[PDB]
Design a binder for this molecule. Structure first.
Ligand code: GNP
Ligand code: MG
Length: 167
């Protein structure tokens, strides 16, 4: 197909849940066991083929540490989609993700497409967040949910493509 679409996507979530790893996996096909905490935000782009449309993602990978919270609107204002990420081995990171969802629903664009990534799914032997519980939470709040693993690549391209399809 010859159609071309471009959308702005932002990743939000508690520090260490794997936002930069998810983006690096999707954009560069890389995964680093040792990834330094992001300062402010990082920016990357990736273009994919969806049906007869070429979709380019402009991705803002935000730093999740609390000291950067006040910068968040600079990154999510104007975003057409967001991926809120938590770590399936850490319930507090899941609670933090719910508060990011609330902030987006109240302060971001009214028509933003919000996805929820239960990341580090490869560490299911240390699970702290029940899959069905997270799926129900996502369903009830109109969020596109998938468990992902930036480490193994599980559902990484899938979550970005599912978002593209809904934009
Ligand atoms: N097992 C596993 N480790 C992962 C996964 N995704 C990220 N990690 C690891 O978790 C750590 C932090 O990842 P990183 O992507 O930097 O997290 P972040 O959410 O960007 N942190 P910040 O918000 O501070 O920038 C790294 O050691 C990374 O290798 C995953 O899917 N599985
Ligand atoms: Mg990061």
């Amino acid at each position: 197909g010859n159609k071309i679409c471009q959308f702005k996507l932002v990743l939000l979530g508690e520090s260490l849940v794997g936002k930069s790893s998810l983006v690096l996996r999707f954009v560069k096909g890389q995964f680093h066991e040792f990834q330094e905490s992001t300062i402010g935000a990082a920016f990357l782009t990736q273009t994919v083929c969806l049906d007869d449309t070429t979709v380019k993602f402009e991705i803002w990978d935000t730093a999740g540490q609390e000291r950067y919270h006040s910068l968040a609107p600079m990154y999510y204002r104007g975003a057409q989609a967001a991926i809120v990420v938590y770590d399936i081995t850490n319930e507090e990171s899941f609670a933090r993700a719910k508060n990011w969802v609330k902030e987006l629903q109240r302060q971001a664009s009214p028509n933003i497409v919000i996805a929820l990534s239960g990341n580090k799914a490869d560490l299911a032997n240390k699970r702290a967040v029940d899959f069905q519980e997270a799926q129900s939470y996502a369903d009830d709040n109109s969020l596109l949910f998938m468990e992902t693993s930036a480490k193994t690549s599980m559902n990484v391209n899938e979550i970005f493509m599912a978002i593209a399809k809904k934009l």
